[PDB]
């Protein structure tokens, strides 16, 4: 009947604590294939464009309730059987520029995660589109046109059964969203940026490997005499050389049927892979599993407590190579009992007090990584 | 990522305490006209059939959450201006039979309410489809095909502005739904049934009125040598005569521009309206307002503490009329200052200990009311 | 069905089914002990042993 | 797979508290005995958009 219920239990605001399913409202099969071109995008949609009209538990609020303030969380039930593992990454960054880019050193790095197409059951990644803080209204990425993804780098060298495109489920969670930023006053505890740099196409047999590589950091990365500035790389420089305990995150996007053990550290990228006894620098390493796979790192100042350059010029050298980095060496006699080839990840979430200073008036020459 | 979240915050059951708007999910304009045939249905839809696809605050749960257990509540914002009032009722009963009926002595009586097309701001009526108790899954009225309504009896004798069809809003409320039933062991405190019997088409001028009428009760009601069993009338009998303080609910479905004052009680329906001083029986009465209008009653055993028949036979009499009832007498000199005609409601929610007993082997003759 | 009374377990996958070979999935079903079961009334008879 | 591995069927007994199974006519009841057979679901490879 009569009532100024014009307030009552009607003015619907609710930053919503729906059960992560009383919150669930998505329905899109995450693409999955075999006859595939290395980096294989299993899509890149939108936030609001994504769809219009999706019958689920949290419903009217997508464009109703007003604002909430948790992390737009996901879990995509996948798997396959047992034979080989693989890499995948979901893209989430900012708005867009023009006919842009589509990779793991690109689409992701704003806020990201890293997963395998057959590991036990599923991966997690709680997306909160606003870095600036937290809370959120419908627009902020809509009218700020960002698009997201899902894709390998590595892959299950053993191409399997069919094209299992699983389910992409999200909405949110009541988590304490962390407002990401990076302190100009360079030398600092912790580090944000992320830095994409994994994988390592490893042959079967035991080719006496040690596929070196630096640890130079800066801007972004190449493409056929073409490059790519990102958020883990450029404000993440300005200064010249970089100085701190950052550490990577390797993984077995390869095999529980093919293994290998590869050190990870800081020696000297002026020593070609054929050293007498290469296992000769302050160690850390592989020894993969059907189960085990994701790995990280840790390399500080008891270790290098002295500068190397977050930069380079297309004409920088080895037989005049300054500084130590992670240029790896196997150990074990590589395998497969089949027709395979190994791999190994690389990444930079947060350091142990990083010394940045100085500047680099300029070059580029986006090191082939 | 990985998680047996197959339970987590996902198994979505929730009997929902959405704010009566975080609960709101309806959108249908309640019909309203002028060139109209007395009883004017402004619709009779369904529960689930009602619509399929309605974007609102409580959304997926209509057919998701499983069960809840409050009352499917409504408030329809209406009004007009100032000139004249009127009657309306929403239909809600049980399933259906065949090509059925459509009235205020019909469609409503299962559970009902009573309102005026211009009273201050709005009416209330919290629908809980299950009488048997409470709680509820999607079916119970669906696959039990009930249909609801909205309509006058009286009306604003002054036909106005246009055809204002307002809004019909519901979903539910966290109320203690009362499981309605009626005790066979007849003599009882309180009474459930409802009994439809209002209105009284009153002329302008001051025709020396007293439009009597009984208080006989039984089964349902006529139509051109045709009748109508209902829930306020038949289990609400079986026994013969009925014996208890029940009381009605009158209202000003008429005028704040036309008034009248009409007693309400128990005298003797064997005295034709022209008595010497009709205001001669243990009183209770009208004296309407622009504001005031809805009224009830109260007539017990200090009063009639002796039997009259919840029944009759088409050949029952006055010049041999047994028992006392509410057969009314005006008082005041009827008005309008225009072109109008008065009215007066009648209803039976709950008594003061009702004595039913005996039975009636049968007749009918559904008293023209 | 297009007059089907009541709710039951009529399942929906989720994930993109696999094998990396030549396979095909499956899923069991059984009733040892309930949580307080309401049986009453009777059924004077039919049969028509539902294809399960 | 491999061949036709017919394993070994071993029994005799155990000192367990054998539970005397029955089912109460007075229908509405806590717990339930009967067992009811109704599993399996022949599921194709690929990802035929199932929900059997």
From Swiss-Prot, chains A, B:
Signal sequence, start to end: none
Site (Interaction with the viral RNA): 17, 174, 190
Disulfide bonds: none
Localization terms from the record: Virion
PTM annotation (N-acetylmethionine): residues: 1
Superkingdom of this protein's organism: Viruses
PTM annotation, UniProt: Not glycosylated.
The protein's assembly and partners: Interacts with the mature small capsid protein. Homomultimer; assembles as pentons. Interacts with the movement protein (via C-terminus).
UniProt function note: Together with the mature small capsid protein, forms an icosahedral capsid (T=3) enclosing the viral positive strand RNA genome, with a diameter of approximately 300 Angstroms. The capsid is formed from 60 copies each of the large and the small capsid protein. The large capsid protein interacts with the viral RNA.
Domain notes: Contains a beta-sheet structure called beta-barrel jelly roll.
The protein's name: Large capsid protein
Organism: Cowpea mosaic virus (strain SB)
Residues included from the entire protein: 460 to 828 of 1046
UniProtKB/Swiss-Prot annotation, chain C:
The record's account of how the chain is modified after translation: Not glycosylated.
Top-rank taxon: Viruses
Compartments, record wording: Virion
Annotated domain remarks: Contains a beta-sheet structure called beta-barrel jelly roll.
Function comment: Together with the mature small capsid protein, forms an icosahedral capsid (T=3) enclosing the viral positive strand RNA genome, with a diameter of approximately 300 Angstroms. The capsid is formed from 60 copies each of the large and the small capsid protein. The large capsid protein interacts with the viral RNA.
Subunit relationships: Interacts with the mature small capsid protein. Homomultimer; assembles as pentons. Interacts with the movement protein (via C-terminus).
Protein name from the UniProt record: Large capsid protein
Species: Cowpea mosaic virus (strain SB) (CPMV)
